[PDB]
Amino acid sequence: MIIPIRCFTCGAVVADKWEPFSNRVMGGEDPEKVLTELGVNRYCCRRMLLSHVNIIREIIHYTRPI
Template identity: 50%
Template sequence: MVMFPIRCFSCGCVISEVYEEYVSRLKNGEDPNAILDDLGIKKYCCRRMYISHRLDKDGRELFDDIMEY
């Protein structure tokens, strides 16, 4: 199991609160950017935390190395 960070690495904002909703909507095939807009994740640094965390085709959670970005 991949743990999602509780806080944004860059600004320290708590980002885990809406994570479960984000993942459930992602599994429904919604666009990540649209979900983040809806959830009020506005800062680019925080959005990056979500967008780099995604599901593979089998629905498993992946967390790309943040240093790639």
């Protein structure tokens, strides 16, 4: 739904690098270069960002009333 706070494999924090990465990649930059500039060097942490699906944006339109 929303980006995890930490990488699943190691305990590195990845949630604060999601907005810069996604904003710059849809701006036309190379994903590998953006990831290397952000400091994400291990592929365990790179799969966290390269495979995230932002579903909370769709879900906020159908939140349970309670």
